[PDB]
Amino acid sequence: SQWLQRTIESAAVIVFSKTTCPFCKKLKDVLAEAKIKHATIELDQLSNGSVIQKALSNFSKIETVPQMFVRGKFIGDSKAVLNYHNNNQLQAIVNENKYDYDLIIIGGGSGGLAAGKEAAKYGAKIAVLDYVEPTPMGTTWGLGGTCVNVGCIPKKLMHQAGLLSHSLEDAQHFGWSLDKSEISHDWSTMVEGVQSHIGSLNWGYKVSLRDNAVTYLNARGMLLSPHEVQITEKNKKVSTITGNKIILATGERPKYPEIPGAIEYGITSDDLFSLPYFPGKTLVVGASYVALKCAGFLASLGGDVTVMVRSILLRGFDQQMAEKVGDYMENHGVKFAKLCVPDEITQLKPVDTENNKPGLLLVKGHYTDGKKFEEEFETVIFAVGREPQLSKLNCEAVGVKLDKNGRVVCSDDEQTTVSNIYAIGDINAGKPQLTPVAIHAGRYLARRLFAGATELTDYSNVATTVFTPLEYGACGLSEEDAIEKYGDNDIEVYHSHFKPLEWTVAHREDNVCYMKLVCRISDNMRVLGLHVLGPNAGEITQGYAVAIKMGATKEDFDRTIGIHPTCSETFTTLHVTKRSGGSAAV
Amino acid sequence: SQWLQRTIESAAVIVFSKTTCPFCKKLKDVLAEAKIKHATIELDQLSNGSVIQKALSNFSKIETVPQMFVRGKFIGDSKAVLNYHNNNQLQAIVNENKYDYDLIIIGGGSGGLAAGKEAAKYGAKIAVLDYVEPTPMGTTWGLGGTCVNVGCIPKKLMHQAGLLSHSLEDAQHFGWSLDKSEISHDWSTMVEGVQSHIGSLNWGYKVSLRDNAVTYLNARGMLLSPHEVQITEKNKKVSTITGNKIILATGERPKYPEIPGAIEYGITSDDLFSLPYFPGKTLVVGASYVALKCAGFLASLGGDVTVMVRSILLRGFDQQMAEKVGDYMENHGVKFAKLCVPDEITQLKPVDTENNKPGLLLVKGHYTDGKKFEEEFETVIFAVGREPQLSKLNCEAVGVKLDKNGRVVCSDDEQTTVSNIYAIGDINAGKPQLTPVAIHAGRYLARRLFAGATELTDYSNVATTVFTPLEYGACGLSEEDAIEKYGDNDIEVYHSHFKPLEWTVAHREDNVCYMKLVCRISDNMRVLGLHVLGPNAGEITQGYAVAIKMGATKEDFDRTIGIHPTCSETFTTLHVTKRSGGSAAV
Ligand SMILES: Cc1cc2nc3c(=O)[nH]c(=O)nc-3n(CC(O)[C@H](O)[C@H](O)COP(=O)(O)OP(=O)(O)OC[C@H]3O[C@@H](n4cnc5c(N)ncnc54)[C@H](O)[C@@H]3O)c2cc1C
Numbered sequence A, B: 001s002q003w004l005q006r007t008i009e010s011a012a013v014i015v016f017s018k019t020t021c022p023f024c025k026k027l028k029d030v031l032a033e034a035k036i037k038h039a040t041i042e043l044d045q046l047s048n049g050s051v052i053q054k055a056l057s058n059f060s061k062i063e064t065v066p067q068m069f070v071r072g073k074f075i076g077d078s079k080a081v082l083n084y085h086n087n088n089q090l091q092a093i094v095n096e097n098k099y100d101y102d103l104i105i106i107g108g109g110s111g112g113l114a115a116g117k118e119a120a121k122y123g124a125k126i127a128v129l130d131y132v133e134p135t136p137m138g139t140t141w142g143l144g145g146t147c148v149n150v151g152c153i154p155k156k157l158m159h160q161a162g163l164l165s166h167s168l169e170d171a172q173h174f175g176w177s178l179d180k181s182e183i184s185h186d187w188s189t190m191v192e193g194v195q196s197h198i199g200s201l202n203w204g205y206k207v208s209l210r211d212n213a214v215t216y217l218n219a220r221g222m223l224l225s226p227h228e229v230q231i232t233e234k235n236k237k238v239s240t241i242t243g244n245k246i247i248l249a250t251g252e253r254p255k256y257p258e259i260p261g262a263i264e265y266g267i268t269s270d271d272l273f274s275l276p277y278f279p280g281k282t283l284v285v286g287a288s289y290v291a292l293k294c295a296g297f298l299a300s301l302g303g304d305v306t307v308m309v310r311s312i313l314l315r316g317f318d319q320q321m322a323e324k325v326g327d328y329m330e331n332h333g334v335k336f337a338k339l340c341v342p343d344e345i346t347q348l349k350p351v352d353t354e355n356n357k358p359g360l361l362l363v364k365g366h367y368t369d370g371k372k373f374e375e376e377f378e379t380v381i382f383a384v385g386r387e388p389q390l391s392k393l394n395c396e397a398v399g400v401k402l403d404k405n406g407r408v409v410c411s412d413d414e415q416t417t418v419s420n421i422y423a424i425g426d427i428n429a430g431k432p433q434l435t436p437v438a439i440h441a442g443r444y445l446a447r448r449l450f451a452g453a454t455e456l457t458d459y460s461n462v463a464t465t466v467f468t469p470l471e472y473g474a475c476g477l478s479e480e481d482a483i484e485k486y487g488d489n490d491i492e493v494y495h496s497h498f499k500p501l502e503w504t505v506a507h508r509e510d511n512v513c514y515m516k517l518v519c520r521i522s523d524n525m526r527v528l529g530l531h532v533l534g535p536n537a538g539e540i541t542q543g544y545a546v547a548i549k550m551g552a553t554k555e556d557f558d559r560t561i562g563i564h565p566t567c568s569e570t571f572t573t574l575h576v577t578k579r580s581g582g583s584a585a586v
């Protein structure tokens, strides 16, 4: 409509087609033959194809299909394009570009490359810029950004190492003759295994870009203008490349509290996953999910672990669930300094760089009542949040609006305040900071830009899992958010404790695993929020995310039959409401 | 309509009410105080509530709420009931009953007690009869039927014991200093733990009934007439109880091949889960899920196991998945005798009871080409199916029709050929033979009988899981059933192999785990069947079964954001179709 204008202007190569057109087939065939990638709109498959079809004439003077366009320019019908092909002019035609690239992606984590690959599918010439600025202590890593190198992957693996600890304890109860008390964990062995897989993922990412004819540049990018990006390469060589669309996907880096010794002596999660030695007696500063995930596996690997909590656990998360996650960790080796903040870190012993041992630090802090905190630790980890650094990008002078937190202010289609610039992933203000969200948005946007797609990313009801020793899966609203949003008398919570069959013989807790469904009474008992604390919580939660996406109700869960025996089946037979005051025990 | 008539006719105690009527609140409160349980139809919550309220006068001669009925008789309004209460006549009135019981349930396994507990909710006086006839070697057990004693619970527990073997192997790779090769397993220790848990379940089942004021008699039941049941108690005392409604829920028992040596020398799953000694070198006859589940954990516990397969694995399941399941087992030590059946079993050595060891058995059989089979085993397990035993219930004389397999024939509301007699669980012909189905169907039936419910059980797309060493979860159609039902050109199959992140560091198989969605093109790529082979298949599959119940399409799956990192998230990004010929490999 006007959709057509935008579509024709921004597509690199696009064919307007109908599935019942043998000339369309022929055209598509020669493009496949010539190995030319392009978008394709099948007008017969759109409810308004006829309107679009007629409207094509304003760009090409014709109303028939197929019609092929390259960067806003009409190239021809079937016969016209076959001529170019037979005459060896087509490659030049499809490669004619006023910019160096159709698309320049700044940042090589989860979002950018997902967007790059997707865009390259439709013939967009694409560059991905990635540069990893080292941690204060000099830690650096390869392509794939946060998740691949210092996030989801190493976390989950170390988490599993942690879980295997519990299985070692449990095996005796299942008839296995194993004394856990003569078994030790070797941190180095674990770290090598982890770093091995990461390195494979680094290369995987490189190869993947290469396989999609996406250009990878290991360089720091900076915006000079809406279409000009300055790059600084390893050799300190500086140059300029131009692009039509620009995607900002630079992610964030961990914050350090502004206290003496923090930068010099502490580490963050950025360093943890490649640490040469077991952290030893550890203080984790922070109470986000990263803080607790790390505290948890370190404890499970037999570390002496303290978690310093400024206010509450898992801000943003259902607070009942947060408390249970915390209570589980406290009962399984993790100590909490509640309502406490650090004031300084001092060094008592340096790292033992020739025996592979940590040093020793003195941490001074205070509780909210003014009482002093003072304790020794071999390692201090800061998990007090993450921040973007788009200052170095020259965003604002190029006209990109940032919010008070330094994040990019975007419309619902990822568009910044500069029309050809977009942002995805962690730097996109207000969006859930998860990897599959970055990837999903990245792919959807690329389709809107280069294939004429109109589907927006839906950021609502994005399921999550916190991989604490007892995992916490969640999809949708927290109880207190649903009550805030809809009022108490419109909210029903169905809940139940449960005990995994596996825990029974292993003599583990009754009534620690717990799940609930928060529901809107007025909306046919609509499922607003799903929450489960238990093993494999992520595998449990995922399937339900689809049902919730589809607008699942309590009746939809009830009418579904359980798989037995599983933890998950408990969601299909919940009946005790909180309002009833009935016991949720097993 | 006539719904109102049926409801009043079969309800034990029922109150017609409105949420906004304080006299209704008042009445319900005195009933509660009196500990009188009843059904409640809140009329202002039924779209035809105004109709029903008028319709009630045909019974009570009044059109106001509350109205209370006992066993078909109008008892009074709020004032009349409170009058009986203050005259100390209320208990006597609600207990008046022409039969000993409102409901008699013959069989105390999965369905029976679920139905029993549910009916007691609404004031139905209920007996649950359970009796366990011992195996041929004299194995007996307590309450809770097959699942609790010789089914799902012991099976899964031992599966877990088996899985721990891989966990021990894996832990070495995650840094734990343990040599799996020097760790032994003790059958008895395991069996002690399992039986201890099974015992606490028997007890739980007994207490549960008691707490619900359901009478439990450990007796064998027999129909004498549509309302009379003969019970035979432990002391061989014989008597007759009467009931208004009867539910048959008597389950099935394992079958034996009609060959010499079978009964005398072999065992079945009824015996396995409490065997005094480890099976040893073992033949498993049969190829159903029970055969393979058992064979699998026996192998994982270091057993020498052979499975004898008459024709195929998992008849009734998707044969591609079946083959992958089998291949996995063969690769991890299960031997298969394919296209083979046994002809006789001979004893070579008797069971050694003073040493607590299995004996030795010669098995002779034959393959489909005639070639002979002759091998020695210490234990032969038959898993060749289950059969009902409704011979002893006297169905024929009373008029309850059975099919050719001796299972009860029932309409879609579980009713038998005798109007007041119903059948649930494994004996209900043509229903999914699974524990949660029995339970669900039981609970729904009790509501239709005693709480005026109208909801029938939907037996379609019931999800299952086979707890083989590598698990297989499924929901909906197999590919072959889908193709046969809809035509090849209307069926699209998306699939992908995957590697659990946990398997990376553990150095487990590339490209063995596998998932697929079987979809119908004509119907908006409707998901007809989901299949997944990998760890925790049951936890993964469960959530999707709600989405499938809701009519999920492929686009519903696609637009759901994955939880990362998990196995399940692979479902939200399937793109490779079988039709495309593209590789499903990671
Ligand atoms: C410890 C931890 C655990 C986590 N666990 C999970 C989890 O289990 N599940 C989950 O869904 N999410 C998890 N996350 C969140 C997560 O992984 C991020 O959401 C994801 O990495 C964001 O992807 P991104 O592409 O937006 O940014 P990033 O992955 O951070 O990548 C951006 C890249 O751009 C680079 N860059 C920055 N500036 C420039 C520049 N000027 N020029 C060129 N390149 C630049 C950066 O170095 C970086 O490599 C975790 C995060 C952390 C810190």
Ligand SMILES: Cc1cc2nc3c(=O)[nH]c(=O)nc-3n(CC(O)[C@H](O)[C@H](O)COP(=O)(O)OP(=O)(O)OC[C@H]3O[C@@H](n4cnc5c(N)ncnc54)[C@H](O)[C@@H]3O)c2cc1C
Pocket: A563, A564, A565, B106, B107, B108, B109, B110, B111, B112, B129, B130, B131, B132, B133, B144, B145, B146, B147, B150, B151, B152, B153, B155, B219, B220, B221, B222, B249, B250, B251, B252, B269, B290, B392, B393, B424, B425, B426, B427, B433, B434, B435, B436, B438
């Ligand atoms: C080895 C094995 C593993 C299994 N694993 C699973 C699984 O992982 N998941 C799953 O969903 N299903 C599983 N099943 C299926 C399963 O357990 C049954 O589907 C379930 O028990 C059916 O419930 P039921 O109440 O109909 O029958 P039952 O549980 O067998 O109960 C019937 C009870 O009534 C008793 N009875 C019989 N006659 C009389 C009489 N005249 N008087 C009084 N009492 C009587 C019986 O002794 C029995 O106790 C498994 C089955 C087996 C054999």
